[PDB]
């Protein structure tokens, strides 16, 4: 018999992104080659099969620094991290291959799906 | 020029609620009289003007336990905490006064609004 507030989930996500911008309560640094990205472990797990696996691990859950595979592109990670916190994906011709490869690695199936459909339309 | 995934914010919130149920990465206990509620500080701040004020405070941000005013009803808090993590509000005749008073204290303006409209319709 509950009532539901339609915009609630979007409002929560907007405030989680505000916390990320102000660096409030961030508990991990993701290292992608020469670049560093601060984030909230809970948001990373909620969006990515890879981070969900990492942060449920009894040893890795306590790490303050996570280093990604050297093949991962920092811009691709940046675009996906922005997507995690906003639902918006900055998908462009010049970055689509890097975004799709990063999404496959991060296990972000909905992003992988769309990257596939956008590449298929161009061939 | 971004594309947007409509269900992303709802999917994030559903996984944050799954983390709460499994007690993963919860970093605070909210004490309401004889009852205890584990939660994520980031979600509490994102939903409540009161917790936003508390956890941006340079001293209170590091507390593992927060005690609420003894006038706060545990059931009212429980209903609001469930709302924070799901967008669903279990608003009933028997709990509406407690829910509205707790929402005013927590500074959850959209919940206060609706409680007011539901009470006005019954008078």
């Amino acid at each position: 018999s509950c009532i539901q507030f339609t915009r609630h989930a979007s409002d929560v996500l907007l405030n989680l992104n505000r916390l990320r911008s102000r660096d409030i309560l961030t508990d991990v640094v993701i290292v992608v080659s020469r670049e560093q990205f601060r984030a909230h472990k809970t948001v990373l797990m909620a969006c990515s099969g890879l981070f969900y696996s990492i942060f449920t691990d009894q040893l890795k859950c306590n790490l303050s620094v996570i280093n990604l595979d050297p093949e991962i592109n920092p811009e691709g990670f940046c675009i996906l991290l922005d997507f995690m916190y906003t639902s918006r994906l900055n998908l462009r011709e010049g970055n689509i291959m890097a975004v799709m490869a990063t999404a496959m690695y991060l296990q972000m199936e909905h992003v992988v799906d769309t990257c596939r459909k956008f590449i298929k339309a161009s061939e | 020029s971004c594309i947007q995934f409509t269900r992303h914010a709802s999917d994030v919130l559903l996984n944050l609620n799954r983390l709460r149920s499994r007690d993963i990465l919860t970093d605070v206990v909210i004490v309401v009289s004889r009852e205890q509620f584990r939660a994520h500080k980031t979600v509490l701040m994102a939903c409540s003007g009161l917790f936003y004020s508390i956890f941006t405070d340079q001293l209170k941000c590091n507390l593992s336990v927060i005690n609420l005013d003894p006038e706060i009803n545990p059931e009212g808090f429980c209903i609001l905490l469930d709302f924070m993590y799901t967008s669903r509000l279990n608003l009933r005749e028997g709990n509406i006064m407690a829910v509205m008073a707790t929402a005013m204290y927590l500074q959850m303006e959209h919940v206060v609004d609706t409680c007011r409209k539901f009470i006005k319709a019954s008078e």
């Binding site: 509950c2 009532i3 539901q4 507030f5 339609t6 | 669903r88 509000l89 959209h110 609706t114």
Partner: peptide
């Protein structure tokens, strides 16, 4: 607010 809606009936879900």
């Amino acid at each position: 607010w809606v009936i879900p």
